[PDB]
């Protein structure tokens, strides 16, 4: 019965990723005065299936100079980690109920960077290497401030349990209490998912295909699926953390509908942002995250430690 | 032997064509936006204060039930 739950989680997520590819193409097309996919299937509804079937029937290449073991391990790690980061999300009930869900997401996301690191190194080509060192720099840029923002926001939750976030925001969204932290968190999640304007690792104009330039076919497809699953997962985490849906214990379907709508809106905002802006230089991302975000985050952390004590508004569950 | 017919501009002249930059101001002042943000923050703080105190009372009640059941 638990395996049925695992499958009912992981298969719909892959289908959502497949159709998010089409939705992104159509949103970008219509923001660019064109249409996007509308031929293969009514309204391009069969385009993701054609893409997947073309990729998995295409020859996979193992580079002559590459390390083969790491070259094959990296996409497996990427996809499995992207699938695993979904299990503690309460929708309104989680698949795996943890005391410290937030720390689990933190650790698994910080493990996910080694997929890019090891694929870029194991390709044994120059553009892949440049992509990998850009990944190193990006993680160094965003990690500390991301963690401090999470701590500051959760100081009103009372714990690290994700389900407590539903009862914390029973009356008001957490975005009305910490909107500067919400802004910094949104930019941090854009940087954490290698999304425009922070899509430095791929670096398409600058680095051809970057870290995954050597990759082709099915192995290449796995990287794409992992990235888009990460997009959806991070936006769902943001929706749970800042726009809290109201949960009726006798009707969880209403909560599920509302939460799915909110995360879809955040994902569409990601696509909008990609369509609207140019790319950062990767030293400029580090300067932004270390000279503007970090001091404000430290000050707001001090403020959010002090405020519940001053106002006698400390949450329960020591 | 009719009149010469050639592509030409119309009698009098064509309408004037705009070319200068046009970027309207289209925004509120900084004071208004800062005030709205601070007001939202204060409203959220006060609502959170009420809710957290209620939650503390509920936790005390549940702990008392556990204390009653312990022996
Ligand atoms: C006793 C226990 C022994 C443990 C063995 C470890 C498992 C590896 C065994 C098979 C790998 C070797 C095959 C090979 O080299 O090419 C084959 C063959 C040869 O190719 P070739 O072109 O003819 O020549 C290549 C050259 O020989 C040159 O080829 P190369 O340059 O690629 O050789 C490098 C390779 C060759 O290996 C060696 O040199 C010796 C092997 C000993 C490695 C053990 C070091 C200890 C590392 C830490 C502990 C790991 C777990 C061990 C415990 C096992 C019990 C659970 O070394 C490695 O890459 C080691 C990687 C394995 C570690 C996997 C860990 C996953 C990390 C995920 C994140 C962790 C999260 C937190 C937890 O090519 C292929 O068939 C395709 C590639 C095969 C890859 C399959 C998947 C990767 C390996 C399975 C990992 C299992 C994880 C569970
Ligand atoms: C500005 O130009 C660009 C675009 O715009 C035109 C892009 O789209 C774009 C992105 C590339 C696109 C062409 C999208 C390509 C679509 C994927 C690579 C295909 C992936 C789809 C599957 C692998 C998903 C999984 C397959 C199943 C059908 C899902 C279910 C899984 C089973 C196990 C069940 C880039 C990089 C770009 O540069
Ligand atoms: C279907 C037929 C089954 C055949 C099994 C063969 C398996 C094998 O090792 O062969 C290597 C095979 C074929 O290569 P070629 O010989 O060049 O082409 C074959 C076409 N004639 O290459 C592969 O595809 C390797 C597949 C990957 C191995 C799968 C297991 C890897 C385990 C990874 C563990 C680590 C995971 C990391 C993330 C987890 C951390 C939480
Ligand atoms: C990679 C590292 C995996 C980390 C898994 C962490 C899972 C987790 O945090 O859940 C904790 C969960 C519940 O704890 P609480 O939430 O505090 O409350 C429970 C009591 N009511 O604890 C557990 O379920 C423990 C179960 C086993 C522990 C995990 C063991 C996994 C180790 C992975 C080793 C990798 C395999 C070996 C090779 C690696 C690379 C080839
Ligand atoms: C009564 C007690 C209250 C205590 C005080 C509380 C009020 C505090 C008010 C200030 C809060 C401001 C928070 C803003 C944090 C960042 C501000 C900032 O300065 O960052 C910018 C940089 O920020 C950015 O430009 C973002 C870059 C990425 C942009 C990507 C697209 C933009 C995002 C679209 C909308 C995002 C919506 C966020 C929230 C979403 C919902 C969660 C600095 O960059 P520069 O202008 O170059 O100058 C620095 C050196 N002089």
UniProtKB/Swiss-Prot annotation, chain A:
Main location: mitochondrion
Gene Ontology biological process terms in this record: aerobic respiration; mitochondrial electron transport, NADH to ubiquinone; mitochondrial respiratory chain complex I assembly
Membrane topology: Multi-pass membrane protein
Catalytic reaction(s) noted: a ubiquinone + NADH + 5 H(+)(in) = a ubiquinol + NAD(+) + 4 H(+)(out)
TM region(s), chain numbering: 2-22, 68-88, 100-120, 146-166, 171-191, 223-243, 253-273, 294-314
Localisation: Mitochondrion inner membrane
A GO CC term assigned to this protein in UniProt: respiratory chain complex I
Root EC class: translocase
Keyword annotations of the record: Electron transport, Membrane, Mitochondrion, Mitochondrion inner membrane, NAD, Respiratory chain, Translocase, Transmembrane, Transmembrane helix, Transport, Ubiquinone
Signal peptide: none
Keyword Membrane appears in the UniProt entry: yes
EC number: 7.1.1.2
Pfam families with a match to the protein in the record: NADHdh (PF00146)
MF terms in GO: NADH dehydrogenase (ubiquinone) activity
Subunit: Core subunit of respiratory chain NADH dehydrogenase (Complex I) which is composed of 45 different subunits.
Family statement drawn from the similarity comment of this UniProt entry: Belongs to the complex I subunit 1 family.
PANTHER family per UniProt: NADH DEHYDROGENASE SUBUNIT 1, NADH-UBIQUINONE OXIDOREDUCTASE CHAIN 1
Role, per record: Core subunit of the mitochondrial membrane respiratory chain NADH dehydrogenase (Complex I) which catalyzes electron transfer from NADH through the respiratory chain, using ubiquinone as an electron acceptor. Essential for the catalytic activity and assembly of complex I.
Record protein name field: NADH-ubiquinone oxidoreductase chain 1
Species the sequence originates in: Sus scrofa (Pig)
Encoding gene (name): MT-ND1
